[PDB]
Design a protein around this ligand. Structure first.
Ligand SMILES: Cc1c(C(=O)NN2CCCCC2)nn(-c2ccc(Cl)cc2Cl)c1-c1ccc(C#CCCO[N+](=O)[O-])cc1
Ligand SMILES: Cc1cc2nc3c(=O)[nH]c(=O)nc-3n(C[C@H](O)[C@H](O)[C@H](O)COP(=O)(O)O)c2cc1C
Ligand SMILES: CCCCCCCC/C=C\CCCCCCCC(=O)OC[C@H](O)CO
Ligand SMILES: CCCCCCCC/C=C\CCCCCCCC(=O)O
Ligand SMILES: CCCCCCCC/C=C\CCCCCCCC(=O)O
Length: 439
């Protein structure tokens, strides 16, 4: 060529111009540069803090984030190198760009593979897991994995080709050998098929010991016990519980506590002359034996005022019935005098003591399993469609329609690298603190 065989030179069927050309250009460039910076931000907090670069779990995030960065950098580079300067790509300069993107996804799948192995060791060798998967072990596994990932990108650059082999070309990518894609597609397809199976088994094994779901049922008229429950809700949410907070007026007692292994009942006391539970709680209290409390871990809280004869008599009545039902009361009830906002240190302190009802390792294994499946599903949603396009290319021919959706499916591949740093921020509670360490 000619017009040039250039990276990001797609068929570009244009419904509207030049607003599309102008607006999509700025939009796509801004999206790309945002990714490079936000994945550069993830790379920073990890290398910056020692409490994380010694963890084997952050050798997994850092690997993903530098894979996301390798691709987002190639995106912005090739976008500004062609849509702004209109420069031409030779054979090697083209394959290097494409190989970089290919390497970014390879290492991403390779990282999810190593994570599955770590979880398999945690499942099969829970006792000695800490001494098996160590910082020097994790570095070697990831360094090896990247060299295997890089090698595949360079293989096309180096040997496999249309030009060098005079082989059948790919209808999507210039210079690319069709039989190389079969090898590439098959390798990642097998790995992903295993990772999908593994991540399901990992998550299933993580629920065999414990689920990490807390239930909070509160009865409140003024809102003091609602504020108390919402405060307890966020402390348990940070500590790795899937917290479900419900007003007593909206629940049915039958089988209420099923599926939860921590249940926190809160109720205010309204003894005008006697002792009475908050009215929305009474229906639950009267049918409490239907909830499934026997053997379950529970604890009570409630707002009251000491100038009444029976200070927080409601939590007394609930705890006594929970004892009579064979519930496992984890600790003594929280009794808040006066305004709960003026006693927040106790509410948070109590929630911290209740937190230990389920061991840290069980909750941590569940959020690790939950986090991995989210990374995986996002990766299948974004990169999946593009892979399906490449499958259409190798076996049979393309279609005019598949060449058009490819322009938008390839943009899905980019926003996978943008939401992964967002996923790390929402689930890795330690990364948030390391971030705030640098203000
Ligand atoms: C095309 C295209 C494009 C592209 O040209 N997008 N256009 C779409 C239309 C408007 C402007 C951008 N962008 N990307 C892209 C996707 C994810 C990352 Cl991390 C990096 C990049 Cl460069 C691609 C892309 C490039 C290569 C692959 C691949 C592969 C395995 C062989 C998949 C997508
Ligand atoms: C009519 C009335 C009766 C009350 N009786 C008691 C009581 O017997 N024992 C107690 O500890 N507090 C009693 N209180 C105080 C409430 O429990 C207190 O106002 C509580 O903070 C309100 O809870 P809530 O806003 O979450 O519904 C009573 C308050 C009122 C207005
Ligand atoms: C393709 C890779 C397949 C398998 C490697 C996974 C095996 C890695 C190590 C197995 C875990 C194990 O049992 O480790 C033994 C440990 O050294 C006791 O001290
Ligand atoms: C050898 C395997 C080495 C490291 C794999 C660690 C996988 C743990 C996933 C951590 C995800 C997280 O931190 O939330
Ligand atoms: C993308 C291919 C993934 C292959 C990575 C293999 C990781 C190496 C396996 C075990 C290393 C243990 C030391």
């Amino acid at each position: 060529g000619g017009r040039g065989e250039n990276f990001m030179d797609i068929e570009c069927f244009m419904v509207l111009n030049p607003s599309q050309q102008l607006a999509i250009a700025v939009l796509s460039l801004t999206l790309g540069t945002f990714t490079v910076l936000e994945n550069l931000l993830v790379l920073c907090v990890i290398l910056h803090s020692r409490s994380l670069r010694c963890r084997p779990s952050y050798h997994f995030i850092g690997s993903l984030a530098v894979a996301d960065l390798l691709g987002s950098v190639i995106f912005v580079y090739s976008f500004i190198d062609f849509h702004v300067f209109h420069r031409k790509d030779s054979r090697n300069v083209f394959l290097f760009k494409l190989g970089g993107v290919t390497a970014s996804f390879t290492a991403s799948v390779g990282s999810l593979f190593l994570a599955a192995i770590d979880r398999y060791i945690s499942i099969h060798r829970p006792l000695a897991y800490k001494r098996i998967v160590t910082r020097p072990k994790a570095v070697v596994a990831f360094c090896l994995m990247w060299t295997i990932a890089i090698v595949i990108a360079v293989l096309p650059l180096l040997g496999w080709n249309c030009e060098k082999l005079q082989s059948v070309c790919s209808d999507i990518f210039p210079h690319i050998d069709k039989t190389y894609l079969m090898f590439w597609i098959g390798v990642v397809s097998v790995l992903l098929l295993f990772i999908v199976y593994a991540y399901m088994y990992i998550l299933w094994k993580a629920h065999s010991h414990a689920v990490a779901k807390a239930l909070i049922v509160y009865g409140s008229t003024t809102g003091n016990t609602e504020y108390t429950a919402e405060t307890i809700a966020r402390e348990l949410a940070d500590a790795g519980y899937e917290v479900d907070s419900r007003d007593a007026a909206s629940v049915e007692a039958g089988g209420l506590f099923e599926g939860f292994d921590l249940v926190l009942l809160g109720c205010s006391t309204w003894g005008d002359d006697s002792i009475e539970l908050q009215d929305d709680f009474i229906p639950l209290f009267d049918s409490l034996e239907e909830t499934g409390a026997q053997g379950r871990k529970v604890a009570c809280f409630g707002c009251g005022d000491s100038s009444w004869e029976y200070f927080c008599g409601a939590v007394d009545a609930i705890e006594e019935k929970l004892k009579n039902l064979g519930a496992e009361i984890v600790q003594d009830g929280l009794r808040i005098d006066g305004d709960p906002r003026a006693a927040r240190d106790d509410i948070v302190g109590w929630a911290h003591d209740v937190r230990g009802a389920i061991p840290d390792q069980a909750r941590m294994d569940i959020e690790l399993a939950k986090t991995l499946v989210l990374i995986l599903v996002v990766l299948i949603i974004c990169w999946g469609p593009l892979l399906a396009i490449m499958v259409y290319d190798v076996f049979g021919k393309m279609n005019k329609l598949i060449k058009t959706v490819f322009a938008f499916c390839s943009m899905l591949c980019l926003l996978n690298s943008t939401v992964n740093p967002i996923i790390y921020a929402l689930r890795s509670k330690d990364l948030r603190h390391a971030f705030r360490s640098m203000f």
